[PDB]
Amino acid sequence: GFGCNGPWDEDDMQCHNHCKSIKGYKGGYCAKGGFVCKCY
């Protein structure tokens, strides 16, 4: 989710921007075949 909707729509930028607005995080990427937004 959060932009990471699998191979038909793997929107790393959307996930990154979700994550970046969470206190303590700086970015994010799609993981697990495109289906999971992982924040870091």
Residue numbers in the entry: 1 to 40
Provide text from the study.
Plectasin consists of 40 amino acids and shows well-defined secondary structural elements in form of an α-helix (M13-S21) and an antiparallel β-sheet (G28-A31; V36-C39). The structure of plectasin is stabilized by three disulfide bridges (C4-C30; C15-C37; C19-C39), which is typical for this type of defensins and leads to high conformational stability. Plectasin contains a cysteine-stabilised α-helix-β-sheet structure, which remains intact upon fibril formation. We have determined the structure, kinetics, and functionality associated with the pH-responsive self-assembly of the enhanced plectasin variant PPI42 into helical protein fibrils.
To elucidate the structural features that allow PPI42 to assemble into fibrils, while the plectasin wildtype did not fibrillate, we determined the crystal structure of the plectasin wildtype at a resolution of 1.1 Å. Our plectasin wildtype structure shows a high similarity to the published crystal structure (PDBID: 3E7U69) with only minor differences in the N-terminal loop (all-atom RMSD: 0.316 Å). When we compared our wildtype plectasin crystal structure to the fibril cryo-EM structure of PPI42, we observed a significant structural difference in the N-terminal loop region between amino acids 9 and 14. Two of these  positions are mutated in PPI42 (D9S; Q14K). We observed a network of polar interactions in the plectasin wildtype with (D9) forming a salt bridge to (N5). When mutated to (S9) in PPI42, the sidechain orientation changes and the sidechain forms a hydrogen bond to the (G6) backbone, which disrupts the network stabilizing this part of the N-terminal loop. In the plectasin wildtype, (H18) is coordinated in two different ways (50/50% distribution) stabilized by polar interaction with (Q14) and π-stacking with (F2), while in PPI42 only the π-stacking with (F2) occurs due to the mutation Q14K. Notably, the sidechains of (E10), (D11), and (D12) form intermolecular interfaces both in the protein crystal of the wildtype and in the fibril of PPI42. However, their orientation differs significantly between wildtype and PPI42. This structural difference may contribute to the different arrangement with the mutant forming the fibril and the wildtype forming the crystal.
